[PDB]
Subunit: 296 residues, 4 copies
Amino acid sequence: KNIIIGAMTALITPFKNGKVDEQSYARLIKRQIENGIDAVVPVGTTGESATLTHEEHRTCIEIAVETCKGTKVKVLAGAGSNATHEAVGLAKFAKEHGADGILSVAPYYNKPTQQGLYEHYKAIAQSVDIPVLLYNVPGRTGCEISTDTIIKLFRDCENIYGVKEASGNIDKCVDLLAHEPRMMLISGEDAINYPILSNGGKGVISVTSNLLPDMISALTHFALDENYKEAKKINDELYNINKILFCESNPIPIKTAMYLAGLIESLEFRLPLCSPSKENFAKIEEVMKKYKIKGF
Amino acid sequence: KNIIIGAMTALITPFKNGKVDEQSYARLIKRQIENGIDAVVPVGTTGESATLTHEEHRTCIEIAVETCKGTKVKVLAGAGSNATHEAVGLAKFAKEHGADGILSVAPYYNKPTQQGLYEHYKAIAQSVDIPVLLYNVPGRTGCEISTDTIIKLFRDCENIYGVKEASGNIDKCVDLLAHEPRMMLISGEDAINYPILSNGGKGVISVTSNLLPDMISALTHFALDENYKEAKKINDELYNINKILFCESNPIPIKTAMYLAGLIESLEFRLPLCSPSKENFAKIEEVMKKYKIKGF
Amino acid sequence: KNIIIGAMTALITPFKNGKVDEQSYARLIKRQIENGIDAVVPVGTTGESATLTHEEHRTCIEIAVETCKGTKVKVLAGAGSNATHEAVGLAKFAKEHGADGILSVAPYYNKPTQQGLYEHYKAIAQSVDIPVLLYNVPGRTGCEISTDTIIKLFRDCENIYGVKEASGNIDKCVDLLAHEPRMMLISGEDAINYPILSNGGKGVISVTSNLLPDMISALTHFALDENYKEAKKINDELYNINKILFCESNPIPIKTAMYLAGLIESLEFRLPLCSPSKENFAKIEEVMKKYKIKGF
Amino acid sequence: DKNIIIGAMTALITPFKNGKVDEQSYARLIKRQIENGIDAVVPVGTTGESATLTHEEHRTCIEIAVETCKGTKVKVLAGAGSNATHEAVGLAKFAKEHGADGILSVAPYYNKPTQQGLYEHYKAIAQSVDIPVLLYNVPGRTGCEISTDTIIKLFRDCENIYGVKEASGNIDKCVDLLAHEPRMMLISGEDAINYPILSNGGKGVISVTSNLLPDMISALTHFALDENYKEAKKINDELYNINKILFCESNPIPIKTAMYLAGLIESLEFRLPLCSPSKENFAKIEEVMKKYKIKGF
Ligand SMILES: N[C@@H](CCCC[NH3+])C(=O)O
Ligand SMILES: N[C@@H](CCCC[NH3+])C(=O)O
Ligand SMILES: N[C@@H](CCCC[NH3+])C(=O)O
Ligand SMILES: N[C@@H](CCCC[NH3+])C(=O)O
């Protein structure tokens, strides 16, 4: 019943001259380790999994795996895809190269049925013997992993242990944990980190933690120790940055914040992702000032 | 800032031969008082505020005040309307007839602007000197009281002390209490009662409490005493009843349950409200059996 | 099946000193008569049906019926309400006082089921012997009259002859007219007047016609005579005014336009409706200069 | 000024046999469309399961499409979309170099970029090739919407962007588009509302129903383009029930089921996460089909 919980980070993927900055990628992973982060998620939605080639996707799981060798920090590698043969491929690469588990996003664009989602995830789970965390973000995929399908996959496949929820649907998180209380519900939405943890959630996969890993790690651990008045206190402080980090489509605002804080050298994206508007740029710079950003 | 918080019930309005049954109305109020309920909300959305004549709206506030005289139970009278001159009339009647405060639903159908909503509520509050609780349910009104508008009304009109949220948006309730922590956030959605209380909410205006007032009252008091593990446990047990009470439009499922429990004489509505479907009738009867329904 | 179709206007209700300007009302309906309008709709959503008293609602049907006598222009009186006893009351007043038919909006706020909508409209239909036109606006009522419910009411009720659609759902209007081609589909959305008429719709109940009755009247008859390129050309010229007349909630922009054109003396609303933002005021005045506004 | 590909078009299904592309049924399904009045074929779209095909299989079905439409008036508007711009430019350049008459490019999915990103995304695609490029907006599946302003700006700034295949169920947006930019080719991507889009100035459809009933879809489009809206609307009303039942589940699950039930494909095979429909929906597809007479090969 292997799980990966606690404070986790959906790592941004820095670019340098149109190639992956492998130097800076490892240097951002050591900033997360030294600020209380329990696990890192390479190549998620925040890692621009869509514009990376299969070798770049694979190269940044390997960099993640060795950058956390000799630490407690686990690697929950992003291995999702809208094609099952593609998702199994990323899952098999992650196991054979030392990953502690995989995050697998619901298939996007092709909108599979609930029966399709079941067989999609069942094929991935049986491909490996490492933990598998589901990932539901219907605003991005066009499809919903129903509560019944999540619970069925948790009960029918032995390495499927929970779901990364990014739904803004607190009703579904009461639904999930009331009918299946043994599952690990992970928040994928920074604004509601504390409410999800306060209802029995056991971790977060955060975007803000790229910028403020100490604050996000403190929030999760306070909540897991049932210290809910301090957990809510950090969640209230983080609301302004949590919402302005979505003024444009993630990960455009967070990479802007990392550039403004000097944590990445160049504000580079891969198309169709671009730098934000000049107005929103000013709004990112203004919200950052109310927080104390840790350096290297 | 005079407040009305705690476990509250949006009481159903029983009909007999298409006229308001005034004697069963009072007998449901000693069932609520006698099971730990802290306040009652006469003629809300659950009370069919839209289908009562102006005298029946007023007569059911009078019964609530009279039946709660000599007790600790307050009366937060429903006084909302989509016409401001109509809302001021009900608000001043509520004070002049002994109500401790008023609930005021956002104007429906006429979809006012944020400036209109500000002036709408600014006009009501200035009519009375008793607490005024806002009520935001955009799924039924077609308009939403913005987070800024709620906070502005809370800060500018002294008797306006909080809001009954039934938006199903936990992000908005972090938004409200992180920027204005002195406001009384009231849950208007039974399925997510505990998460709203766990984030600093100070009460509920419940539909489920019509049938199980002791459980809903226990949930709120557990949470207000910061016993979040027992509050969540009741919230998880109540999920099935909380959602099956909305398989059809409120208050059709709850009135069906009250009739099945022998607490009201007739499964009677006034059009356009009708008895539920044949199928949903069976679903209410089936979910009720897993709960212990307290009598008179 | 007696019908009321063609180019129709949802009349604005002018106020002076917080009262209904009854003589500016009659002179505004006669501006509509002399510009090709086939029927007038007193006290619709554009007429602020929500803030008028029940006697003021009745007074503006009387003015509408009286002004149209001796004309070929029909009066489709607004008689909808979220309470069936209120809608039947208005329906019987319209028949007994000379209206040619009634418009009845879907019940708002209390969200009846499809079974409730059937009994609601059937009770209204058996109330009178004049044509009854349904009115579907889900953005404001929170409920929708399904295609199946509309078709049943058309087939089961003699005087029920069609539906005013304001959903922005051209799929539903293909659904309606492909399965029941004998019904009169009326456009309730000015921007898509021509597409709805081009698919077999037989009229519009317009907001823009308050300001530009000649263009809406020309558009409808061009389309009804199957002159689709001239109907489409007028619909294309009117797009800019059709959409900016909803930059704020109707009838706030249209009353602003009527005031700017000197067709009403005071830009007065009844709360919670208010005058528009100062920006939208400037942008309405800006779009208006591209059209030739007919006087009295 | 602009080169376009309009008329009655078909979003081709991709038949599978034992987990690979049945290349001989693919060519025989495009050869069924040609003789039934279809003006162009769209290989490997959303209906073609572009997401589960390898890049080498995606390219193989553009090649089959180009060869099968040689000697005929039937054009190839090849599916070349991707959520990665370098991937979309790759598919765009392959299509030109291999004989396609144009490319369809879906709005980037999942990464949901901003309007500025969509502009630069499509400008890179348009400048990679010199053949027409048709935009494709389906927000229900991609999570993003190409605003009216971005479509119009892309139409005016780049030669080969000549229109958009709309699948939004938003007739307001199609009045917005053609009232402010009437020189663009608006293509319906939603079979139920083919006629309303054509009646407002649309100049073609990229159809799913045409996979099963190409003659009816072809007659509908040409009736509408000849401004005979009473026969065009009559066919659109006749086609509504099948137009709706082909989406009881997510496309292309119902359409491939219908093709299998009609004996036009041999195996009801998908690539995961796409699967066979429920037995319940299976029965509802079978029953709506009988009220129509399906042409064979
Ligand atoms: N077009 C694929 C490429 C994924 C490659 C691995 N990250 C997608 O965006 O899903
Ligand atoms: N149908 C009326 C009822 C008013 C009288 C009691 N609230 C309304 O919704 O405003
Ligand atoms: N506020 C009431 C007024 C109804 C009187 C008739 N216009 C309602 O909208 O239901
Ligand atoms: N799964 C990939 C497939 C790309 C190859 C064909 N488009 C995607 O959706 O982008």
